[PDB]
Write a protein that binds this DNA or RNA. Structure first.
Length: 157
RNA sequence: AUUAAGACAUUCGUGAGUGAUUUAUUUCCAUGAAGUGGCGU
């Protein structure tokens, strides 16, 4: 329940972060200015965040094992500490104290944090010379962009 | 009783066969978890 996400005893992390985050509880107020700055609202959001940040993932996870079976052998890389953020632009904000102000990218079905394939494709393409579209606004930086990226791609290849 | 009388432009016949609303596109850019000591002279 509290840790070890799994599929039998878990709460959908995206559900908790987006739909269940701002559930209306007795004695909890964040409609008024006083309510948004109150300590009760801060405690409510603290408990919700603690519920969010209590789940671990095992290496032998049936979810991850199914992902490996469906999509082949993965490329395993490890996160370093500034942290890692995905889907920062998703609207998640009311104006209260102790709440998560930025968005997060959760899978709808599994609820696990993930990076969409579009994000990976765009990030990888951005380091290639012809990622920038030849347009009126981009034509000033277009030659330098390709010139700089082509050398990088050449050495990497 | 008169170059006259009789005679359906009709029968059969699928607007049907092939076709991916798809290709290209980073929810990203900027941002200090910081500021301050106070009194007992």
């Amino acid at each position: 329940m509290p840790k070890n996400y799994t599929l039998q005893n878990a709460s959908n992390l995206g559900w908790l972060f987006y739909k269940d985050y701002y559930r209306q509880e007795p004695n909890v107020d964040f409609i008024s200015t006083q309510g948004k700055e109150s300590d009760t609202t801060a405690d409510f959001f603290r408990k919700t965040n603690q519920r969010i940040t209590a789940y671990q993932l095992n290496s032998e996870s049936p979810l991850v094992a199914a992902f490996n079976n469906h999509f082949g052998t993965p490329l395993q890389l490890k996160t370093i500490y500034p942290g890692l953020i995905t889907g920062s632009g998703l609207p998640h904000q009311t104006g209260s104290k102790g709440e998560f102000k930025l968005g997060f990218q959760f899978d709808y079905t599994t609820g696990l944090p993930y990076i969409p394939g579009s994000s990976i494709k765009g990030t990888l393409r951005s380091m290639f010379p012809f990622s920038l579209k030849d347009k009126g606004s981009t034509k000033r930086i277009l030659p330098e962009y390709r010139k700089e990226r082509m050398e990088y791609i050449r050495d990497l290849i």
